[PDB]
Amino acid sequence: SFELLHAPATVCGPKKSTNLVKNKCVNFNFNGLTGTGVLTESNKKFLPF
Amino acid sequence: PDPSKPSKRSPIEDLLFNKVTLADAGFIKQYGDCLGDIAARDLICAQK
C-alpha cells in the first residue's frame, strides 16, 4: 500500500544521491510524482495540504 | 494614416486594433507560472 502525498517522503531506492538536475529536460521524480520535464525553482504559493 | 499612431493606421484603424482583445494563440507563450520570457521571440511559444 503506497501513500504518495504532501509532507516529506522517507523511503526511496538504493540509488545515488543527487539533489536535482536543473534547466534540462530530465524524467523528474520528486515525492513519488513522476513525469518528463524541465526543472526550475518554484515561483507559486502552496498550502500545507 | 495618422503618423503619430503606430504604423500606417488612421485614427479609426487605431481604434479598430485597440478595441479587439487578443489573448489567444501566440500571445500566450508560457503557462502555469513557469519561468522565462513571455515577450518578443526570446523564448519558445508553447502555449499551454
For B13-48, give the DSSP string.
HHHHHHTS---STTS----SS-SS--STTSS-----
Contacts with B16 (C-beta within 8 Å, 6 or more apart), sequence order: B9
Cell of B33: 507560472
Report chain B residues whose CB lies below 8 A from the CB of A41: 35
Experimental determination approach used? cryo-EM
Closest-CA residue of B relative to A45 is B33
Alpha carbon A30 to its chain's center = 1
Pairwise CA distance, residues A3 & A22, whole Å: 27
Pairwise CA distance, residues B38 & B24, whole Å: 14
Best of B30, B35, B43 to substitute, by most chain A Cβ atoms within 10 angstroms, is B35
Q: Would an 8 Å CB–CB cutoff place A43 in contact with chain B?
A: yes
